[PDB]
Amino acid sequence: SMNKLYIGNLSDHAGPADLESVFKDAKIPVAGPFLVKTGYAFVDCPDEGWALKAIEALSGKMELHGKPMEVEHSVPKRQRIRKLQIRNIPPHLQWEVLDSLLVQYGVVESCEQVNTDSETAVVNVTYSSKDQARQALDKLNGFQLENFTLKVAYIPDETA
RNA sequence: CACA
Structure with missing residues:
Protein backbone atom coordinates (compact mmCIF):
# COMPACT_ATOMS: atom_id res chain seq x y z
CA SER A 1 0.00 0.00 0.00
CA VAL A 75 9.78 3.79 -2.42
CA PRO A 76 12.43 1.05 -2.04
CA LYS A 77 15.35 1.71 -4.40
CA ARG A 78 14.85 -1.52 -6.36
CA GLN A 79 11.14 -0.70 -6.90
CA ARG A 80 11.79 2.52 -8.84
CA ILE A 81 11.00 1.03 -12.23
CA ARG A 82 7.94 1.69 -14.41
CA LYS A 83 5.56 3.55 -12.12
CA LEU A 84 5.20 7.26 -11.35
CA GLN A 85 2.75 9.57 -9.67
CA ILE A 86 2.05 13.00 -11.17
CA ARG A 87 0.78 15.79 -8.86
CA ASN A 88 -0.28 19.42 -9.27
CA ILE A 89 -2.15 18.69 -12.51
CA PRO A 90 -4.30 21.67 -13.61
CA PRO A 91 -7.90 21.20 -12.46
CA HIS A 92 -9.38 21.43 -15.97
CA LEU A 93 -6.62 19.85 -18.06
CA GLN A 94 -8.25 17.54 -20.59
CA TRP A 95 -7.00 13.98 -20.32
CA GLU A 96 -6.09 14.00 -24.04
CA VAL A 97 -3.68 16.85 -23.43
CA LEU A 98 -2.07 15.06 -20.49
CA ASP A 99 -1.82 11.93 -22.65
CA SER A 100 -0.08 13.95 -25.39
CA LEU A 101 2.65 14.76 -22.85
CA LEU A 102 2.99 11.25 -21.41
CA VAL A 103 3.45 9.48 -24.73
CA GLN A 104 6.41 11.67 -25.61
CA TYR A 105 8.46 9.47 -23.24
CA GLY A 106 7.19 5.96 -23.91
CA VAL A 107 4.20 3.66 -24.02
CA VAL A 108 1.67 4.27 -21.25
CA GLU A 109 0.41 0.92 -19.92
CA SER A 110 -2.05 2.62 -17.59
CA CYS A 111 -2.91 6.05 -16.27
CA GLU A 112 -5.24 6.08 -13.22
CA GLN A 113 -6.78 9.13 -11.62
CA VAL A 114 -6.23 9.35 -7.87
CA ASN A 115 -9.21 11.04 -6.24
CA THR A 116 -8.10 13.90 -4.02
CA ASP A 117 -9.39 16.84 -2.01
CA SER A 118 -7.11 19.38 -3.71
CA GLU A 119 -8.02 21.63 -6.62
CA THR A 120 -5.32 19.86 -8.65
CA ALA A 121 -5.53 16.35 -10.07
CA VAL A 122 -3.23 13.37 -9.41
CA VAL A 123 -2.54 10.40 -11.67
CA ASN A 124 -0.52 7.22 -11.31
CA VAL A 125 1.19 6.21 -14.55
CA THR A 126 2.79 2.91 -15.54
CA TYR A 127 5.19 3.05 -18.47
CA SER A 128 6.22 -0.09 -20.32
CA SER A 129 9.90 0.18 -19.33
CA LYS A 130 12.21 1.55 -16.65
CA ASP A 131 13.99 3.78 -19.20
CA GLN A 132 10.72 5.36 -20.34
CA ALA A 133 9.61 6.19 -16.80
CA ARG A 134 13.03 7.62 -15.96
CA GLN A 135 12.86 9.91 -18.98
CA ALA A 136 9.29 10.99 -18.15
CA LEU A 137 10.26 11.68 -14.53
CA ASP A 138 13.26 13.77 -15.63
CA LYS A 139 11.36 15.81 -18.27
CA LEU A 140 7.86 16.15 -16.75
CA ASN A 141 8.93 17.08 -13.22
CA GLY A 142 8.90 20.88 -13.09
CA PHE A 143 6.97 21.30 -16.33
CA GLN A 144 4.74 24.41 -16.22
CA LEU A 145 1.31 24.52 -17.79
CA GLU A 146 -1.96 26.38 -17.19
CA ASN A 147 -0.29 28.18 -14.25
CA PHE A 148 0.80 24.98 -12.47
CA THR A 149 4.09 23.12 -12.12
CA LEU A 150 3.80 19.33 -12.44
CA LYS A 151 5.39 17.25 -9.70
CA VAL A 152 6.48 13.74 -10.70
CA ALA A 153 7.86 11.04 -8.40
CA TYR A 154 8.40 7.30 -8.35
CA ILE A 155 5.89 5.01 -6.69
CA PRO A 156 6.56 1.34 -5.88
CA ASP A 157 6.73 -0.99 -8.88
CA GLU A 158 6.28 -4.33 -7.10
CA THR A 159 5.68 -6.56 -10.14
CA ALA A 160 8.37 -5.65 -12.70
C1' C B 1 14.93 6.06 0.84
C1' A B 2 16.24 2.58 6.06
C1' C B 3 20.86 -2.74 5.52
C1' A B 4 27.48 -3.20 10.86
Whole structure:
Protein backbone atom coordinates (compact mmCIF):
# COMPACT_ATOMS: atom_id res chain seq x y z
CA SER A 1 0.00 0.00 0.00
CA MET A 2 1.05 3.64 -0.45
CA ASN A 3 0.70 4.82 3.13
CA LYS A 4 4.47 5.04 3.82
CA LEU A 5 6.21 8.42 3.78
CA TYR A 6 9.80 9.48 3.26
CA ILE A 7 10.78 12.76 4.90
CA GLY A 8 13.89 14.31 3.40
CA ASN A 9 16.16 17.35 3.73
CA LEU A 10 15.97 17.26 7.51
CA SER A 11 18.26 19.35 9.71
CA ASP A 12 21.02 17.76 11.72
CA HIS A 13 19.06 18.20 14.98
CA ALA A 14 15.52 17.43 13.76
CA GLY A 15 14.04 14.78 16.04
CA PRO A 16 10.81 12.82 16.38
CA ALA A 17 9.24 15.54 18.52
CA ASP A 18 9.88 18.13 15.80
CA LEU A 19 8.27 15.91 13.16
CA GLU A 20 5.40 15.01 15.48
CA SER A 21 4.61 18.72 15.86
CA VAL A 22 4.83 19.33 12.10
CA PHE A 23 2.26 16.61 11.34
CA LYS A 24 0.03 17.64 14.26
CA ASP A 25 -0.14 21.25 13.05
CA ALA A 26 -1.23 20.09 9.57
CA LYS A 27 -3.66 17.61 11.16
CA ILE A 28 -2.23 14.50 9.51
CA PRO A 29 -2.70 11.38 11.66
CA VAL A 30 0.08 8.83 11.58
CA ALA A 31 -0.20 5.11 12.23
CA GLY A 32 3.21 4.60 13.80
CA PRO A 33 6.29 6.33 15.14
CA PHE A 34 8.65 8.62 13.28
CA LEU A 35 11.89 6.75 12.52
CA VAL A 36 14.55 9.48 12.26
CA LYS A 37 17.89 8.70 10.58
CA THR A 38 20.70 11.07 9.49
CA GLY A 39 19.09 13.81 7.42
CA TYR A 40 15.85 11.90 6.75
CA ALA A 41 12.99 10.06 8.43
CA PHE A 42 10.07 7.70 7.76
CA VAL A 43 6.50 7.59 9.04
CA ASP A 44 3.34 5.63 8.16
CA CYS A 45 -0.04 7.28 7.63
CA PRO A 46 -3.22 5.25 8.29
CA ASP A 47 -4.09 4.90 4.56
CA GLU A 48 -3.20 6.18 1.10
CA GLY A 49 -5.39 9.27 1.16
CA TRP A 50 -3.72 10.68 4.28
CA ALA A 51 -0.23 10.04 2.91
CA LEU A 52 -1.08 11.98 -0.25
CA LYS A 53 -2.58 14.75 1.90
CA ALA A 54 0.75 15.04 3.73
CA ILE A 55 2.77 15.13 0.52
CA GLU A 56 0.53 17.76 -1.07
CA ALA A 57 0.47 19.83 2.14
CA LEU A 58 4.12 19.65 3.24
CA SER A 59 6.50 18.71 0.45
CA GLY A 60 8.43 21.72 -0.75
CA LYS A 61 6.26 24.00 1.40
CA MET A 62 6.95 23.44 5.14
CA GLU A 63 10.22 24.76 6.56
CA LEU A 64 11.67 23.07 9.66
CA HIS A 65 14.81 24.51 11.27
CA GLY A 66 15.06 26.73 8.21
CA LYS A 67 15.02 23.91 5.63
CA PRO A 68 12.12 23.02 3.31
CA MET A 69 10.96 19.48 4.04
CA GLU A 70 10.67 16.84 1.35
CA VAL A 71 7.67 14.62 2.01
CA GLU A 72 7.26 11.89 -0.58
CA HIS A 73 6.04 8.33 -0.99
CA SER A 74 8.67 6.02 0.44
CA VAL A 75 9.78 3.79 -2.42
CA PRO A 76 12.43 1.05 -2.04
CA LYS A 77 15.35 1.71 -4.40
CA ARG A 78 14.85 -1.52 -6.36
CA GLN A 79 11.14 -0.70 -6.90
CA ARG A 80 11.79 2.52 -8.84
CA ILE A 81 11.00 1.03 -12.23
CA ARG A 82 7.94 1.69 -14.41
CA LYS A 83 5.56 3.55 -12.12
CA LEU A 84 5.20 7.26 -11.35
CA GLN A 85 2.75 9.57 -9.67
CA ILE A 86 2.05 13.00 -11.17
CA ARG A 87 0.78 15.79 -8.86
CA ASN A 88 -0.28 19.42 -9.27
CA ILE A 89 -2.15 18.69 -12.51
CA PRO A 90 -4.30 21.67 -13.61
CA PRO A 91 -7.90 21.20 -12.46
CA HIS A 92 -9.38 21.43 -15.97
CA LEU A 93 -6.62 19.85 -18.06
CA GLN A 94 -8.25 17.54 -20.59
CA TRP A 95 -7.00 13.98 -20.32
CA GLU A 96 -6.09 14.00 -24.04
CA VAL A 97 -3.68 16.85 -23.43
CA LEU A 98 -2.07 15.06 -20.49
CA ASP A 99 -1.82 11.93 -22.65
CA SER A 100 -0.08 13.95 -25.39
CA LEU A 101 2.65 14.76 -22.85
CA LEU A 102 2.99 11.25 -21.41
CA VAL A 103 3.45 9.48 -24.73
CA GLN A 104 6.41 11.67 -25.61
CA TYR A 105 8.46 9.47 -23.24
CA GLY A 106 7.19 5.96 -23.91
CA VAL A 107 4.20 3.66 -24.02
CA VAL A 108 1.67 4.27 -21.25
CA GLU A 109 0.41 0.92 -19.92
CA SER A 110 -2.05 2.62 -17.59
CA CYS A 111 -2.91 6.05 -16.27
CA GLU A 112 -5.24 6.08 -13.22
CA GLN A 113 -6.78 9.13 -11.62
CA VAL A 114 -6.23 9.35 -7.87
CA ASN A 115 -9.21 11.04 -6.24
CA THR A 116 -8.10 13.90 -4.02
CA ASP A 117 -9.39 16.84 -2.01
CA SER A 118 -7.11 19.38 -3.71
CA GLU A 119 -8.02 21.63 -6.62
CA THR A 120 -5.32 19.86 -8.65
CA ALA A 121 -5.53 16.35 -10.07
CA VAL A 122 -3.23 13.37 -9.41
CA VAL A 123 -2.54 10.40 -11.67
CA ASN A 124 -0.52 7.22 -11.31
CA VAL A 125 1.19 6.21 -14.55
CA THR A 126 2.79 2.91 -15.54
CA TYR A 127 5.19 3.05 -18.47
CA SER A 128 6.22 -0.09 -20.32
CA SER A 129 9.90 0.18 -19.33
CA LYS A 130 12.21 1.55 -16.65
CA ASP A 131 13.99 3.78 -19.20
CA GLN A 132 10.72 5.36 -20.34
CA ALA A 133 9.61 6.19 -16.80
CA ARG A 134 13.03 7.62 -15.96
CA GLN A 135 12.86 9.91 -18.98
CA ALA A 136 9.29 10.99 -18.15
CA LEU A 137 10.26 11.68 -14.53
CA ASP A 138 13.26 13.77 -15.63
CA LYS A 139 11.36 15.81 -18.27
CA LEU A 140 7.86 16.15 -16.75
CA ASN A 141 8.93 17.08 -13.22
CA GLY A 142 8.90 20.88 -13.09
CA PHE A 143 6.97 21.30 -16.33
CA GLN A 144 4.74 24.41 -16.22
CA LEU A 145 1.31 24.52 -17.79
CA GLU A 146 -1.96 26.38 -17.19
CA ASN A 147 -0.29 28.18 -14.25
CA PHE A 148 0.80 24.98 -12.47
CA THR A 149 4.09 23.12 -12.12
CA LEU A 150 3.80 19.33 -12.44
CA LYS A 151 5.39 17.25 -9.70
CA VAL A 152 6.48 13.74 -10.70
CA ALA A 153 7.86 11.04 -8.40
CA TYR A 154 8.40 7.30 -8.35
CA ILE A 155 5.89 5.01 -6.69
CA PRO A 156 6.56 1.34 -5.88
CA ASP A 157 6.73 -0.99 -8.88
CA GLU A 158 6.28 -4.33 -7.10
CA THR A 159 5.68 -6.56 -10.14
CA ALA A 160 8.37 -5.65 -12.70
C1' C B 1 14.93 6.06 0.84
C1' A B 2 16.24 2.58 6.06
C1' C B 3 20.86 -2.74 5.52
C1' A B 4 27.48 -3.20 10.86
